[PDB]
Symmetry: C3
Subunit: 437 residues, 3 copies
């Protein structure tokens, strides 16, 4: 009946090497589904179920069939980052130490070769409608990389959760948990992909859509990356929809586009500890960036307090290099220690247009305030307190900076005249109305 | 064991008579088997408990005190108990069915003592110490409080929204929880979660409950998405307090909560792209220093209750309250649609001009590009609920009604109000706020 | 089974490969026989779940669902582009890794319905009248496949007609709290048609290469269509609703080639917000027949030319004066949308016209604010290589357009920052206009 359970397959042992078990199942599916056109069918695929459990993976799974679903019964997330920064003598008193759910532990050496699941098939048609649902992929530990952070804080292990190498259509990744992977999810050459309602956190990079793609969506995810990685990344995508995500720290950025066109980054909650939250680069054009909530503030947790993404406060929270984009209805909260602003004496920048023409920036609210950077060892207490604290002085900021290399833009109701730094001769600027008469 | 349980395949007890006892027995088995936290890089992976479609009475509270427990069913099982309890009782035997169904947990607990609502919860999630309980999942089953009871309100008992029962109560600090695809019906409180971090309440059906979603204590980085929600007139549809970075989006919130969305001390959050329908003022309330929030591209409809049993029941608030009321600093109210569809004779107080957006306190609020449409209609009532409701929603033939689109109280200043009403429609001190009237002809 | 769980491959004497319809009907009869009493121990008709493992199942008998709380579920949406495959030369088929959709697959082998009886061609029909309304039926994570399109006198190749008389799911009766989630629909004349819906959720489906995808008919209320991937055919609807109040349409990625992306008739107090919409024809979003008090906000619209040869000369019959967004109704709100108009200046229809982006044909009190129009002139070219041609066209980057056209039959509108003065064609005496500032 094309239904398998990894704990009820006579070949191998999923506790020791679930990779071998799953590859054996896939070989069985192929052996039984050899003919493509028998009675209007022949290759319907299969479903492979992972009950809740701790499964070591020592052999990469190769998925080269369409319509394979791999499903579990728990995303299984717990903060390994918090736990590895608890003093080791306290670990015996903790209720648990590891992630759980339907848990695949990635015991591969260190980039597609370090992926727990590799989806690859060349030829025609494109591999289609593979589904990953409601299980946990855990890369266990981060390791030394010469960064000189403690090993468990490097976000480096050469491991990937799911890597799709080949052109693909109608794929789904839903309800997953990804934790402690250098890369959670990397999908090349995607068409009509849906990455929906996952929890992708404490991974160096979370979601990367590489090569090219079209007509895809990234919706309703909880996402948190590492300071040298991407939270959500796309390159050469057309018609991408990125919405209803709650992106929290500490990726280098929240959303990073290279050569992305005719796409929408709308209605997300985005929180970063560094500038450069949303980056439209390398001729990213005709995109809508609307009604997102941006918060940029300082890391409040001591283990990462001095760690950042190398970008200064002139970068912008939103940076655009490309033509004919639309930036409408966003909220930006800029909550920083004025003494720590880099470069020394700079006025921080919120929206920066570095290149391109015809960008329309309208109806954006910037709120900037000056607050001392607190540092505490208790992660979630420090995080919640920092989010709720509004004890602050108003801070002068540049709402919109148009560099001379970007021209013929339209900037409306996105800051006062002094807040909008731009050549009025070659841009259409309307300052937000002033108080009074 | 492979950590998978089915409540109809357990040796002891009877899930029809007391599924709570059965589930607690299963949880005890999980804990007995998963005692070690660090064996081969694991040891406490949790489990899944499956509820096939069926009618299951719960007479003992389920206590969930382990991480990575999933409780799942095969239906959300909603039917309108409200409509059925307002059909004359003598006609009940002729109806195709009466009760909710799906994978149905019937909450047969007594109400908890004063200040102990947790005792009336079918499922209580609680564990202290470290780390925080994490990644518990509730999926695709039905929780049914069965009846509402007499409470001194003067309403018929089944219309009180009172029974002291909760569906799911999370008492302890928690991380990465999920509540998805559920059906909640006829509970005084559907879902109450304290101290939530990175919670997702997604694609549920939470209706005919006194209060639906309440996020209490504090929280962060959570989301409430894609839900169908309808509460009762003394209760909350979506409530949060002391949350930062909450995202509330893609919900369809219908009557008859006291409010649609109610924030106390909520900061740096977004209430965006929801459809919100209320029968009373005070639909979206930002209170007690609720600051730096985005309230964008929502569709607000306020009209009069059209169903006879509730025609004269309301949330106590007059039409000067506002549909959206803000007490806090630096918020952003952008791109919303407001439909105010009321019978002028029914406006309270007598002869008042209704208020749409009210800024009661705070500075730096940015209100831009909001369309207000106000219509003077009649008070049509009908005994047939679905007929009355559809007829009222589709009826747009009406005369104009003068409203105050934006009211800025003296307690609020240094706000910016753009293209959200004509000069007459914006009642505000021009000296201390930045005001641009919507252009008119 | 006493526990109300059924697997179609375990049904005694059933053969779901030959006729899964007969199997599912037999299961429904079994459920009804066991669940006869409505009020025993505060219950009695809890419903059931029917599971379809991955497999190829022919349906030769319509399934009739007339009980509340029935869930039909599978383990795979199973989509593959039968459209691409049927346009690959037949001599190349043997080298293809697969030819057909899969997953938990219901192949609809029903004949077309009689005149005015399209419900007869539905694989699943949900119907029950009387009280209470049928409630909380769920369809989840399976594939419905109408296999082939057939000749219809259009002159297209048979597999490109989008015509077969088949429906995936047809709900005929008033309904409450229904769900359609995680489905795949392919090669059906109509994917999903739901009449008289209350508090419906159509969420996270893949509904493509169907003549029409989602149709909400009759009337309805308090429903939502969210997070779907949708692509229809040139004579049909992508998302259609009539006489709905309080509908929420959001977070959908609608790609070609429906006649429209979103089409409302008599829809009120609803929201079409934060969708990505891509069409090859004008008339992408249509608010018609007194569609009033709707929010149309922060959508991304792209209109360009079909790049794939088999459909290059096929369209929806509408010219470039139609508008990408057309409104006939009162008191709507059009806010924060992006429009990309990417067309061949030499081929604009009618000859010599200037394309229209937003058109108000009738009604009063519409508020149109803060919309960005981007228009460009690109030569229309054809190639036979579907996904290469499609991706290339999306990635490829002036033309004069009318951003907002207010016909004389619509008045008392407010148009702000949605076009230069030249780009707004409207009577200034009876509409309030603020031109986007220029340089
Ligand atoms: O609060 C959101 C999430 O934050 C945690 C805990 O906090 C962490 C610790 O590394 O720091 C960042 C938040 O600043 C997150 O990437 C990471 O993961 C989740 O445990 C929590 O779910
Ligand atoms: O229309 C959405 C929902 O409304 C019903 C029916 O109507 C009710 C009856 O109490 O009144 C309110 C709506 O005005 C809802 O809270 C409630 O529940 C669901 O039967 C229906 O799903
Ligand atoms: O790219 C989105 C979807 O497009 C396909 C392939 O392209 C098609 C072929 O008929 O043309 C339209 C898009 O122009 C789609 O309706 C249709 O289906 C899916 O294979 C693909 O998932």
């Amino acid at each position: 009946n094309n239904r398998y359970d990894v704990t009820e397959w006579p070949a191998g042992n999923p506790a020791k090497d679930i990779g071998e078990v799953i590859n054996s199942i896939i070989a069985d599916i192929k052996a039984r589904q050899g003919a493509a056109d028998v009675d209007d069918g022949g290759k319907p695929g299969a479903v492979i179920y992972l009950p809740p459990g701790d499964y070591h993976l020592r052999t990469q799974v190769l998925i080269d069939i369409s319509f394979l679903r791999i499903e579990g019964s728990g995303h299984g997330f717990t903060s390994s980052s918090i736990r590895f920064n608890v003093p080791e003598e306290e670990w015996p008193d903790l209720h648990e130490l590891w992630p759980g759910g339907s848990r695949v532990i990635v015991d591969l050496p260190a980039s597609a070769a370090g992926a727990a699941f590799l989806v690859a098939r060349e030829g025609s048609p494109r591999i289609s409608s593979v589904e990953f649902s409601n299980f946990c992929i855990d890369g266990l530990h981060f390791t030394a990389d010469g960064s000189g952070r403690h090993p468990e804080n490097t976000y480096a292990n050469g491991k990937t959760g799911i890597h799709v190498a080949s052109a693909n259509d109608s794929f789904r990744v839903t309800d997953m948990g990804f934790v402690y992977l250098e890369n959670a999810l990397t999908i090349h050459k995607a068409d009509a992909l849906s990455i929906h309602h996952n929890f992708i956190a404490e991974c160096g990079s979370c979601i990367e859509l590489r090569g090219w793609g079209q007509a895809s969506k990234i919706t309703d995810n909880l996402v948190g990356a590492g300071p040298r990685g991407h939270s959500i990344y796309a390159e050469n995508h057309g018609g991408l929809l990125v919405t209803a995500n709650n992106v929290f720290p500490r990726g280098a950025s929240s959303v990073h586009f290279k050569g992305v066109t005719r796409s929408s980054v709308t209605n997300n909650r985005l929180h970063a500890f560094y500038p450069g939250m949303v980056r439209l680069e390398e001729n990213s054009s005709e995109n809508l960036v609307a009604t997102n909530h941006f918060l940029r503030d300082h890391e409040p947790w001591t283990p990462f307090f001095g760690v950042d993404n190398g970008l200064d406060d002139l970068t912008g929270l939103l940076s655009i290099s490309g033509n004919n984009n639309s930036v409408i209805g966003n909220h930006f909260s800029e909550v920083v220690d004025a003494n720590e602003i880099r470069p020394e004496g700079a006025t921080p920048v919120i929206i920066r247009l570095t290149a391109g023409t015809g960008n329309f920036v309208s109806t954006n609210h910037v709120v900037a305030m000056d607050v001392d950077a607190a540092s505490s060892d208790s992660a979630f207490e420090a995080q919640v307190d920092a989010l709720l604290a509004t004890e602050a002085a108003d801070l002068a900021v540049t709402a919109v900076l148009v560099d001379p290399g970007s021209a013929r833009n339209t900037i409306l109701d996105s800051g006062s005249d002094t807040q909008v730094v731009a050549d009025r001769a070659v841009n259409a600027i309307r300052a937000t109305p002033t108080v009074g008469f």
